[PDB]
Amino acid sequence: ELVASAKAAISQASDVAALDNVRVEYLGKKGHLTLQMTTLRELPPE
Secondary structure: OOOOHHHHHHHOOOOOOOOOOHHHHHHHHHHHHHHOOHHHHOOOOO
16 A cells, blocks of 8 residues: 555556656656655654
8 A cells, every 4th residue: 555556656657658758657657756755754753
């Protein structure tokens, strides 16, 4: 969940990539994984 649901919408979007628009999914997905890494300000510090 989420950890793999975001990667499921990432690799599937990079499957039907006609031209070299792999860089465009590189933008939104690595932006999602750079933004959903901001949730590391919670959780136990252990």
